[PDB]
Enzyme design. Structure first.
Site, PDB file in Angstrom:
ATOM      1  N   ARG A   1      12.655-110.318  11.481  1.00 36.83           N
ATOM      2  CA  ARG A   1      12.849-109.798  12.830  1.00 36.83           C
ATOM      3  C   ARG A   1      13.744-110.633  13.726  1.00 36.83           C
ATOM      4  O   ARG A   1      14.178-110.137  14.781  1.00 36.83           O
ATOM      5  CB  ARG A   1      11.529-109.496  13.513  1.00 36.83           C
ATOM      6  CG  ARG A   1      10.765-108.355  12.888  1.00 36.83           C
ATOM      7  CD  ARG A   1       9.460-108.195  13.628  1.00 36.83           C
ATOM      8  NE  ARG A   1       8.402-108.997  13.059  1.00 36.83           N
ATOM      9  CZ  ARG A   1       7.240-109.254  13.628  1.00 36.83           C
ATOM     10  NH1 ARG A   1       7.042-108.835  14.859  1.00 36.83           N
ATOM     11  NH2 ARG A   1       6.310-109.996  12.983  1.00 36.83           N
TER      12      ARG A   1
ATOM     13  N   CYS B   1       7.241-107.683   9.161  1.00 41.05           N
ATOM     14  CA  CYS B   1       8.624-108.018   8.837  1.00 41.05           C
ATOM     15  C   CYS B   1       8.992-109.455   9.216  1.00 41.05           C
ATOM     16  O   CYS B   1       8.872-109.854  10.370  1.00 41.05           O
ATOM     17  CB  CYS B   1       9.575-107.061   9.602  1.00 41.05           C
ATOM     18  SG  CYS B   1      11.310-107.411   9.225  1.00 41.05           S
TER      19      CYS B   1
ATOM     20  N   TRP C   1      18.774-106.609   4.434  1.00 38.73           N
ATOM     21  CA  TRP C   1      19.172-107.312   3.197  1.00 38.73           C
ATOM     22  C   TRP C   1      17.956-108.083   2.657  1.00 38.73           C
ATOM     23  O   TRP C   1      17.016-108.405   3.399  1.00 38.73           O
ATOM     24  CB  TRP C   1      20.311-108.322   3.440  1.00 38.73           C
ATOM     25  CG  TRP C   1      19.987-109.341   4.488  1.00 38.73           C
ATOM     26  CD1 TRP C   1      19.129-110.466   4.375  1.00 38.73           C
ATOM     27  CD2 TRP C   1      20.477-109.350   5.831  1.00 38.73           C
ATOM     28  NE1 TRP C   1      19.101-111.129   5.575  1.00 38.73           N
ATOM     29  CE2 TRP C   1      19.885-110.455   6.489  1.00 38.73           C
ATOM     30  CE3 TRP C   1      21.337-108.495   6.564  1.00 38.73           C
ATOM     31  CZ2 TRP C   1      20.171-110.757   7.830  1.00 38.73           C
ATOM     32  CZ3 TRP C   1      21.616-108.798   7.888  1.00 38.73           C
ATOM     33  CH2 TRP C   1      21.044-109.921   8.509  1.00 38.73           C
TER      34      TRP C   1
ATOM     35  N   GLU D   1      11.485-110.831  -2.828  1.00 37.94           N
ATOM     36  CA  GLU D   1      11.163-109.423  -2.895  1.00 37.94           C
ATOM     37  C   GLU D   1      11.511-108.902  -4.275  1.00 37.94           C
ATOM     38  O   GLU D   1      10.701-108.225  -4.905  1.00 37.94           O
ATOM     39  CB  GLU D   1      11.877-108.631  -1.823  1.00 37.94           C
ATOM     40  CG  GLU D   1      11.351-108.895  -0.408  1.00 37.94           C
ATOM     41  CD  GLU D   1      12.130-108.052   0.636  1.00 37.94           C
ATOM     42  OE1 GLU D   1      11.726-106.889   0.838  1.00 37.94           O
ATOM     43  OE2 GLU D   1      13.182-108.510   1.200  1.00 37.94           O
TER      44      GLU D   1
HETATM   45  C1  HEM Z   1      17.688-107.987   7.821  1.00 36.59           C
HETATM   46  C2  HEM Z   1      16.945-108.626   6.912  1.00 36.59           C
HETATM   47  C3  HEM Z   1      15.460-108.265   6.656  1.00 36.59           C
HETATM   48  C4  HEM Z   1      14.593-108.980   5.929  1.00 36.59           C
HETATM   49  C5  HEM Z   1      14.860-110.312   5.162  1.00 36.59           C
HETATM   50  C6  HEM Z   1      13.346-108.255   5.922  1.00 36.59           C
HETATM   51  C7  HEM Z   1      12.216-108.654   5.261  1.00 36.59           C
HETATM   52  C8  HEM Z   1      11.042-107.966   5.078  1.00 36.59           C
HETATM   53  C9  HEM Z   1      10.002-108.281   4.138  1.00 36.59           C
HETATM   54  C10 HEM Z   1       9.992-109.442   3.116  1.00 36.59           C
HETATM   55  C11 HEM Z   1       9.007-107.431   4.338  1.00 36.59           C
HETATM   56  C12 HEM Z   1       7.696-107.383   3.519  1.00 36.59           C
HETATM   57  C13 HEM Z   1       8.214-106.488   2.414  1.00 36.59           C
HETATM   58  C14 HEM Z   1       7.310-106.281   1.257  1.00 36.59           C
HETATM   59  O1  HEM Z   1       7.120-107.265   0.492  1.00 36.59           O
HETATM   60  O2  HEM Z   1       6.861-105.104   1.144  1.00 36.59           O
HETATM   61  C15 HEM Z   1       9.383-106.505   5.357  1.00 36.59           C
HETATM   62  C16 HEM Z   1       8.654-105.458   5.874  1.00 36.59           C
HETATM   63  C17 HEM Z   1       9.149-104.661   6.886  1.00 36.59           C
HETATM   64  N1  HEM Z   1      10.437-104.636   7.461  1.00 36.59           N
HETATM   65 FE1  HEM Z   1      11.832-106.092   7.420  1.00 36.59          FE
HETATM   66  N2  HEM Z   1      13.477-107.141   6.715  1.00 36.59           N
HETATM   67  C18 HEM Z   1      14.773-107.103   7.159  1.00 36.59           C
HETATM   68  C19 HEM Z   1      15.317-106.069   7.919  1.00 36.59           C
HETATM   69  C20 HEM Z   1      14.597-105.030   8.448  1.00 36.59           C
HETATM   70  C21 HEM Z   1      15.122-103.979   9.309  1.00 36.59           C
HETATM   71  C22 HEM Z   1      16.643-103.793   9.695  1.00 36.59           C
HETATM   72  C23 HEM Z   1      14.053-103.212   9.632  1.00 36.59           C
HETATM   73  C24 HEM Z   1      13.977-101.964  10.512  1.00 36.59           C
HETATM   74  C25 HEM Z   1      15.040-101.801  11.281  1.00 36.59           C
HETATM   75  C26 HEM Z   1      12.869-103.766   9.030  1.00 36.59           C
HETATM   76  C27 HEM Z   1      11.616-103.239   9.173  1.00 36.59           C
HETATM   77  C28 HEM Z   1      10.516-103.599   8.410  1.00 36.59           C
HETATM   78  C29 HEM Z   1       9.214-102.938   8.519  1.00 36.59           C
HETATM   79  C30 HEM Z   1       8.740-101.795   9.467  1.00 36.59           C
HETATM   80  C31 HEM Z   1       8.340-103.668   7.544  1.00 36.59           C
HETATM   81  C32 HEM Z   1       6.878-103.339   7.270  1.00 36.59           C
HETATM   82  C33 HEM Z   1       6.988-102.315   6.167  1.00 36.59           C
HETATM   83  C34 HEM Z   1       5.622-102.025   5.642  1.00 36.59           C
HETATM   84  O3  HEM Z   1       4.656-102.042   6.500  1.00 36.59           O
HETATM   85  O4  HEM Z   1       5.559-101.777   4.379  1.00 36.59           O
HETATM   86  N3  HEM Z   1      13.238-104.846   8.283  1.00 36.59           N
HETATM   87  N4  HEM Z   1      10.616-106.886   5.813  1.00 36.59           N
HETATM   88  C1  LIG Z   2      14.857-102.957   5.536  1.00 34.89           C
HETATM   89  C2  LIG Z   2      14.140-103.984   4.658  1.00 34.89           C
HETATM   90  C3  LIG Z   2      14.754-105.157   4.226  1.00 34.89           C
HETATM   91  C4  LIG Z   2      14.093-106.057   3.394  1.00 34.89           C
HETATM   92  N1  LIG Z   2      14.702-107.196   2.962  1.00 34.89           N
HETATM   93  N2  LIG Z   2      12.845-105.790   2.966  1.00 34.89           N
HETATM   94  C5  LIG Z   2      12.203-104.664   3.387  1.00 34.89           C
HETATM   95  C6  LIG Z   2      10.794-104.389   2.918  1.00 34.89           C
HETATM   96  C7  LIG Z   2      10.787-103.312   1.838  1.00 34.89           C
HETATM   97  C8  LIG Z   2      11.592-103.709   0.600  1.00 34.89           C
HETATM   98  N3  LIG Z   2      10.605-104.319  -0.304  1.00 34.89           N
HETATM   99  C9  LIG Z   2       9.315-103.665  -0.042  1.00 34.89           C
HETATM  100  C10 LIG Z   2       9.365-103.015   1.334  1.00 34.89           C
HETATM  101  O1  LIG Z   2       9.142-101.616   1.174  1.00 34.89           O
HETATM  102  C11 LIG Z   2       7.993-101.059   1.783  1.00 34.89           C
HETATM  103  C12 LIG Z   2       7.112-100.779   0.568  1.00 34.89           C
HETATM  104  N4  LIG Z   2       5.832-100.121   0.813  1.00 34.89           N
HETATM  105  C13 LIG Z   2       5.050-100.320   2.024  1.00 34.89           C
HETATM  106  C14 LIG Z   2       3.680-100.926   1.706  1.00 34.89           C
HETATM  107  C15 LIG Z   2       2.744 -99.847   1.220  1.00 34.89           C
HETATM  108  C16 LIG Z   2       1.872 -99.125   2.055  1.00 34.89           C
HETATM  109  C17 LIG Z   2       1.030 -98.136   1.538  1.00 34.89           C
HETATM  110  C18 LIG Z   2       1.078 -97.887   0.176  1.00 34.89           C
HETATM  111  C19 LIG Z   2       1.948 -98.612  -0.656  1.00 34.89           C
HETATM  112  F1  LIG Z   2       2.031 -98.390  -1.985  1.00 34.89           F
HETATM  113  C20 LIG Z   2       2.777 -99.589  -0.131  1.00 34.89           C
HETATM  114  C21 LIG Z   2      12.844-103.752   4.232  1.00 34.89           C
END
Ligand code: HEM
Ligand SMILES: Cc1cc(N)nc(C[C@H]2CNC[C@@H]2OCCNCCc2cccc(F)c2)c1
Ligand code: HEM
Ligand SMILES: Cc1cc(N)nc(C[C@H]2CNC[C@@H]2OCCNCCc2cccc(F)c2)c1
Ligand SMILES: C[C@H](O)[C@H](O)[C@H]1CNc2nc(N)[nH]c(=O)c2N1
Ligand SMILES: C[C@H](O)[C@H](O)[C@H]1CNc2nc(N)[nH]c(=O)c2N1
Ligand SMILES: [Zn+2]
Lengths: 411, 407
Positions: free
Chosen positions: B109, B106, B278, B283
């Site tokens: 963070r 993420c 957000w 994305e």
């Molecule tokens: C507030 C603005 C936030 C932004 C701009 C953001 C951005 C992102 C982005 C760009 C990714 C990679 C997503 C992708 O392309 O699949 C991601 C993954 C992730 N975000 Fe954040 N996020 C935000 C908030 C949060 C919040 C509030 C949480 C949890 C409380 C969070 C938890 C996660 C987790 C656990 C991942 C990894 C998900 C995975 O392994 O697929 N995010 N985030």
């Molecule tokens: C809360 C929040 C905010 C934000 N701006 N952005 C995010 C990331 C999610 C939205 N945009 C994609 C992410 O969603 C998680 C998508 N899947 C996890 C990766 C995965 C693992 C195994 C198999 C699969 F097919 C895919 C979260």
């Protein structure tokens, strides 16, 4: 044990068995991944195993494993090592060695070409002037008037590590960088230190934005010597854009031949510390990294100004917009001058086909995703969606510390 | 043991010690790097509980205290007897904030300590979950001024009584295969969309049909619910210089709300814990819109642009891609919905890393995911070495409920 990699765009799954033949280490543990860390005298004792293993590979590939020519050669190397402590590669084994080091270069997207490498054997070279000559010939052969051909030139292997052949330049052709007294930089900022060394060895620097650096060459452990590559040998391409006519007025140009000169080539346990190799450029190496990295020529702002982009907020994507134009310009200029270049779409797609074939026929293709994915438009190239498995095979290319850091000056 | 990470654009070097606290495994070995692979008991529970509570009490600077020790006993007594235990609210908030703080993929963070946590552990039914969800959706949307949130449903027990949100995001568009062979809507949600119809949903068989929630309480069969249309803030997609852009008919929702992950705190497993923040523009503009296997619209945008699509070397995809992304950021900003660009997001993340290095001793970071899917190297994260490792509390993936649920 079999490992699977999936392509998340095509759902194509591949099975890797080749990582099994992998002995060197990655820097990673089950507790830490160092996948984005840029950098994570032998004994008779350690040498024959490395020899044996290499010759077993070589002989298998020629379909001769266990032959008499195979046993005899092992026995021969075995004796030569105990008697002399090192050993000499046959031409055939060197060639194969060098092609395999490329084939194993996990950070190289250009590998579909690996078997076409022109190998030049420079193991009879004894002096820096001897090296200048070999290098000049490599440059002319590889340049081929713009129809670039891949090639490597291989100088004598390390012996006691006190008699190393080294090319002090990081590439055979690179532009000078000059730090000014006001902190600014003229030329390529990446080459400032090396530039200084050259000046200090008595190079008279013209001090422009694109001065081709001299070669600094170390033969047999001696102090390096300077040489000027014949200019008629350095193909350069002035950079213009196919619609923006002010682009040419930026005064940009680039050399056509990328030729990495600072790597160590390891084959069957032998170490070739001078082994310059060259291919041809993928456009983003110049247009993204060389021109647009903040600590390279950094032309994003000036290009942006000239395009009159809204530079007042990043969310206008003016940076991104200028980056695409500059990269368009680079490809345009090369194709127009008929100098080989490849765009990142075409290159990455080739790598995918290469990689699948490698799994099919070899059981694997070690690949470093952090490096294979281009520095612009990542996800609209197919490698982004490709899982990869990164591991170390030999023969291999490795980094070595800069020689000015280690060299014992003879004075 | 003490590792360094260098930034190759600024030369700044940071020392990582936090990784020594790492617990879980990466999938890598000394022989092989899996860095680009997307997915590489009473006895078990007390160690986990202890280790969580020790970090909790040390975070509040009461490490050792009698209050600390008593809690350790109390949780121990409860595990020993009940074979599980319950988090204090304070521990639940801390646990959740930290799972985000520890999410190495993420980029967002820097925000981690501002999480609004909604404790839904008193929930018992899917109608109750729906209510919590709608409240979460409305609080977080905040009329366009998004606020990060997580709603936490009861923790797993025997694992035949799991709460699950079957949707992958609270808000996603449907996908339908056609006799045509093409795909209508979001090709990513095609299966789930089926699973909805198979559950009774009336799909409008459109391109941007907001999926219905499929909620599963206490292990029961999951139920359908439509999120009040007025709770789903959506942005029509226009370009600040292409008139014809409107005609592409593109829209996206404002609230990214991940719902299919499992939150592990102190060895307790929360299998329904939807969270939201957000969007970073890319994305939607890069992945949702231009992924070949997504809405895949580069082709059309390219045509509308009258770019030479004859050869890859014109960079026409790259041109269209930038434009598509200018338009997304443009659309959200115009309509006053929070969105961040990749330059701003990655720059703030570099600041967050530096804060974490000096404040915590490090920051687990997965470069493969942090570097945006466009203009990688012109963002500062490209040149940043990162160390990737697993700390708890954490968000983990979990099998799709339908492969798992017994009807
Ligand atoms: C507030 C603005 C936030 C932004 C701009 C953001 C951005 C992102 C982005 C760009 C990714 C990679 C997503 C992708 O392309 O699949 C991601 C993954 C992730 N975000 Fe954040 N996020 C935000 C908030 C949060 C919040 C509030 C949480 C949890 C409380 C969070 C938890 C996660 C987790 C656990 C991942 C990894 C998900 C995975 O392994 O697929 N995010 N985030
Ligand atoms: C809360 C929040 C905010 C934000 N701006 N952005 C995010 C990331 C999610 C939205 N945009 C994609 C992410 O969603 C998680 C998508 N899947 C996890 C990766 C995965 C693992 C195994 C198999 C699969 F097919 C895919 C979260
Ligand atoms: C044929 C055209 C070629 C292309 C387009 C190509 C492309 C690339 C690119 C884009 C990189 C990434 C390095 C960076 O961006 O910093 C790379 C790395 C590398 N290439 Fe190739 N390559 C080509 C030919 C060759 C040849 C002929 C060799 C050796 C015989 C070679 C060996 C390597 C090695 C060892 C690396 C890793 C270098 C490093 O770690 O910095 N390449 N290549
Ligand atoms: C032969 C060939 C053809 C081609 N197109 N492209 C290439 C890669 C080089 C050219 N453009 C950049 C790469 O040059 C090698 C750059 N340096 C090695 C990476 C490194 C390691 C450790 C510390 C550092 F700071 C940097 C080779
Ligand atoms: C820190 C990070 O790993 C480093 O910047 C790498 C990322 N990927 C790269 N990829 C290529 N091809 N060339 C590079 O110089 C780098 N730099
Ligand atoms: C195969 C590769 O690991 C995979 O495509 C990853 C790469 N980086 C990513 N990065 C983000 N932010 N999101 C993703 O879905 C992916 N996909
Ligand atoms: Zn790894």
């Amino acid at each position: 044990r079999f490992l699977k990699v999936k392509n998340w765009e095509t759902d194509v799954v591949l099975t890797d068995t080749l990582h099994l033949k992998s002995t060197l280490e990655t820097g990673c543990t089950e507790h830490i991944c160092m996948g984005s860390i840029v950098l994570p005298v032998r004994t008779k004792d350690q040498l024959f195993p490395l020899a044996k293993e290499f010759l077993d590979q070589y002989y298998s590939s020629i379909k001769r494993f266990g032959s008499k020519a195979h046993m005899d050669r092992l026995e021969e190397v075995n004796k030569e090592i105990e008697s002399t402590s090192t050993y000499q590669l046959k031409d055939t084994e060197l060639i194969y060695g060098a092609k395999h080091a490329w084939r194993n270069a996990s950070r190289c997207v250009g590998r579909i070409q690996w078997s076409k490498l022109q190998v030049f054997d420079a193991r009879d070279c004894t002096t820096a002037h001897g090296m200048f000559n070999y290098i000049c010939n490599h440059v002319k052969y590889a340049t081929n008037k713009g129809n670039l051909r891949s090639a490597i030139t291989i100088f004598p292997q390390r012996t006691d590590g006190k008699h190393d052949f080294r090319v002090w330049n990081s590439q055979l052709i690179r532009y000078a960088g000059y730090k000014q007294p006001d902190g600014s930089t003229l030329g390529d900022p990446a080459n400032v230190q090396f530039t200084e060394i050259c000046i200090q060895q008595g190079w008279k620097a013209p001090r422009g934005r694109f001065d081709v650096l001299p070669l600094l060459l170390q033969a047999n452990g001696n102090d390096p010597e300077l040489f000027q590559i014949p200019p008629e040998l350095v193909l350069e391409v002035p950079i213009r854009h196919p619609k923006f006519d002010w682009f040419k007025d930026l005064g940009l140009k680039w050399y056509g031949l990328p030729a990495v000169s600072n790597m160590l080539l390891e084959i069957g346990g032998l170490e070739f510390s001078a082994c310059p190799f060259s291919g041809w450029y993928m456009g983003t190496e110049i247009g993204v990294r060389n021109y647009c990295d903040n600590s390279r020529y950094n032309i994003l702002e000036e290009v942006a100004k000239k395009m009159d982009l809204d530079m007042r907020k990043t969310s206008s994507l003016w940076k991104d917009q200028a980056l695409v134009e500059i990269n368009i310009a680079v490809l345009y200029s090369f194709q127009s001058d008929k100098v080989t270049i490849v765009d990142h779409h075409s290159a990455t797609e080739s790598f995918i086909k290469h990689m699948e074939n490698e799994y099919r026929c070899r059981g694997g293709c070690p690949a470093d995703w952090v490096w294979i994915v281009p520095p612009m438009s990542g996800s609209i190239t197919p490698v982004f969606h490709q899982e990869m498995l990164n591991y170390r095979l030999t023969p291999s290319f490795e980094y070595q510390p800069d020689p000015w850091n280690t060299h014992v000056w003879k004075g």
